[PDB]
Design a protein around this ligand. Structure first.
Ligand SMILES: [Ca+2]
Ligand SMILES: [Ca+2]
Ligand SMILES: [Mn+2]
Length: 386
């Protein structure tokens, strides 16, 4: 296997309570792994609850962990960090979080859409936190200039975290042309980069017309015009072109390159989607690693048997150069679940999926040596990093 899946899945809490849906359904994690604890924890994750049929619960939420497995809500935090929208006309989606070393703060992004045709379109929005508990607009951010001034005291390391206290990073008049924003600070060029998938005003059925665009920003707040990436995905094992759906990017210092796990597909839409790996020296020009999928749906009846969904990763360096560990928090869905018994996070059959649970949404984990993973992807039993 390119990655070894851990049995069961990880317990993320979801705030919603809805009789027609099983509890604690979640998707689209984004994990930050730090060298030293930030507000008590080395691992921080943003994620969204989600269920079939209604998207109103799909609101950025935060947890933290000492091990990347057992997640908790930090004391004093109340999820979600961005409120439930006032009606089903709107929904949130696609959270991604970065640690800003210069400000010692986390920056959590997400996508907000007006789903109504001929509506106002969508935005990528942003909440920042100093303390891990309060997520919003820094008190030293000036909304008139869009400058985040560095705090000069501990008392200036605060935010406003009310319902309206977010920054609009990007706006578009189309609904679905900035899906799954993923952000990295490029410490060579000294610029923030955001990649997103442009599905126009169409979305899930746009299919092979989809393409990834990148944008640049000096601060992570105000962004330039998009340009298309090149070579993002290649051919699968049948020689069929893959299209992007959702993605996560990291710069990996040990490999001297950007690395992306892409949730992608070869047919008309992301049903049955898989993960593929793709790399780049510059963030612009990519090359898929091999033809084989990094991760695929499990066997019929497993919690990940319909599709692999957006996934987040950390390359954990080893004691020698080029010999790290790929740690992957993957979301996925199980098909055909209405009224069916499904697994709990320990892999035991204790959860009754409900009437309107057409599918079940969960977050799990997979891992491998980077070298072993590359050997599988490349069909090269002797691959080692250069
Ligand atoms: Ca990320
Ligand atoms: Ca630098
Ligand atoms: Mn999404």
């Amino acid at each position: 296997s390119a990655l070894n899946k851990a049995p069961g899945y990880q317990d993320f809490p979801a705030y919603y309570s809805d009789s027609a849906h099983a509890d604690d359904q979640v998707t689209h994690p984004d994990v930050v792994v730090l060298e030293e604890p930030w507000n008590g924890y080395r691992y921080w994750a943003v994620y969204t609850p989600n269920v079939m049929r209604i998207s109103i619960y799909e609101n950025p939420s935060i947890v933290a962990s000492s091990d990347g497995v057992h997640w908790v809500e930090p004391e004093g935090l109340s999820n979600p960090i961005e409120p439930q929208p006032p009606s089903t006309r709107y929904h949130n989606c696609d959270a991604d979080m970065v640690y800003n070393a210069e400000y010692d703060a986390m920056m959590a992004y997400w996508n907000w859409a007006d789903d109504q045709g001929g509506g106002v379109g969508a935005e990528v929005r942003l909440r920042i936190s100093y303390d891990g508990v309060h997520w919003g607009v820094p008190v030293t951010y000036d909304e008139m200039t869009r400058v985040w001034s560095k705090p000069t005291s501990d008392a200036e390391r605060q935010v406003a975290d009310g319902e309206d206290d977010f920054i609009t990073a990007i706006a578009s008049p189309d609904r679905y042309d900035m899906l799954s924003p993923t952000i990295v600070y490029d410490d060579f060029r000294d610029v923030f980069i955001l990649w997103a998938n442009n599905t126009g005003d169409v979305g899930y059925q746009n299919g092979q017309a989809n393409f990834v665009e990148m944008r640049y920003s000096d601060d992570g707040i105000t962004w330039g015009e998009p340009v298309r990436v090149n070579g993002f995905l290649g051919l699968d094992e049948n020689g069929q072109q893959l299209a992007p759906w959702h993605q996560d990017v990291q710069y990996v210092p040990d490999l001297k390159e950007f690395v992306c796990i892409s949730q992608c597909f070869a047919g008309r839409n992301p049903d049955g989607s898989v993960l593929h790996l793709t790399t780049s020296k510059d963030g612009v020009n990519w090359e898929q690693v091999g033809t084989k999928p990094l991760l695929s749906p499990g066997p019929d009846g497993s919690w990940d048997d319909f599709q692999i969904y957006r996934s987040s990763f950390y390359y954990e360096p080893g004691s020698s150069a080029g010999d790290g560990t790929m740690r992957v928090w993957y979301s996925a869905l199980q098909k055909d679940t209405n009224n069916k018994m499904v697994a709990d996070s320990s892999g035991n059959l204790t959860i009754q999926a409900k009437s309107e649970d057409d599918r079940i949404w969960r977050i799990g984990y997979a891992e491998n040596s980077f070298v072993e993973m590359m050997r599988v992807l490349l069909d090269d039993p002797g691959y080692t990093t250069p």
